[PDB]
Design a binder for this molecule. Structure first.
Ligand SMILES: NS(=O)(=O)c1ccc(NC(=S)Nc2cccc(I)c2)cc1
Ligand SMILES: [Zn+2]
Length: 257
């Protein structure tokens, strides 16, 4: 199975998922001097006030906080998007050290971690149909740097003990994802892919300019999670990030001058 180790990591993925070398792969480096301001871009609309979180899951690659997406409760729209995208889950990618961990980079700078809030286009009826479409998903990416703690993250951090190993899940209702956002909604956007297998080229990427700060103690507890299942040799869940992929024939647009 694919992973992030020496023998099954990002350099291996193309063998089972040929699209790894495709024309709109993610993540990418965001070159801030080359990204063009696009005045025709609309403000982002994040409507999370009716969000219903259900569960948190260690899936052996990261942990997912899952939401009830059987109704328009938590949706993303506007920006570069047409139509409504429902929140289905969010997850993080992070490093073994504070100097690495994000998937996207900004002028080659790596952040300590990166949050992905995953949304699917309601015109395709379910998530499985949506990932088969070029405009099927919208993922909102948010960088994390280490500094002051993020109060809105602590509920997540405190449950990680109960989902230490692969396949474990825990009840996680009444969590408000609005506590994970930065102040500004300024963003870059470009067409890309899932950053893990099957690497489908179905994503409109929306990456926020402003990082959130988390504490060293918060990211430390990320790093205490396990890739392996219970009763297996311990491998710490760290460096579950794919590095920057060739931009090729794409332009990154900025929502801001
Ligand atoms: N890291 S990311 O580009 O935000 C991202 C978002 C969603 C997924 N995978 C979803 S949740 N599961 C999935 C998707 C497509 C096919 C299959 I099989 C499983 C995988 C990666
Ligand atoms: Zn991700």
């Amino acid at each position: 199975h694919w992973g992030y180790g020496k023998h099954n990591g990002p350099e291996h993925w193309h063998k089972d998922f040929p699209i790894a070398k495709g024309e709109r792969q993610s993540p990418v480096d965001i070159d801030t001097h080359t990204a063009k301001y696009d005045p025709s871009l609309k403000p982002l609309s994040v409507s999370y006030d009716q969000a219903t979180s259900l569960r948190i899951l260690n899936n052996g690659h990261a942990f997912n906080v899952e939401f009830d997406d059987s109704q328009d409760k938590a949706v993303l729209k506007g920006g570069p998007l047409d139509g409504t995208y429902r929140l289905i889950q969010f997850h993080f990618h992070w490093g073994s050290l504070d100097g690495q961990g994000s998937e996207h980079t900004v002028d080659k700078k790596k952040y300590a971690a990166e949050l992905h809030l995953v949304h699917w286009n309601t015109k395709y009826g379910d998530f499985g149909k949506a990932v088969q479409q070029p405009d099927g998903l919208a993922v909102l990416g948010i960088f994390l740097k280490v500094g002051s703690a993020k109060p809105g993250l602590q509920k997540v951090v405190d449950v990680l003990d109960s989902i230490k190993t692969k396949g474990k899940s825990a009840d996680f209702t009444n969590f408000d994802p609005r506590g994970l956002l930065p102040e500004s909604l300024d963003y870059w956007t470009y067409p890309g892919s899932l950053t893990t297998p099957p690497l489908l080229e179905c994503v409109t990427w929306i990456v926020l300019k402003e990082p959130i700060s988390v504490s060293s103690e918060q990211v430390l507890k990320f790093r205490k999670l396990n890739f392996n299942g219970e009763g297996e040799p311990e491998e710490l869940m760290v460096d579950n990030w794919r590095p920057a992929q060739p931009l090729k024939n794409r332009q990154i647009k900025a929502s801001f001058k």
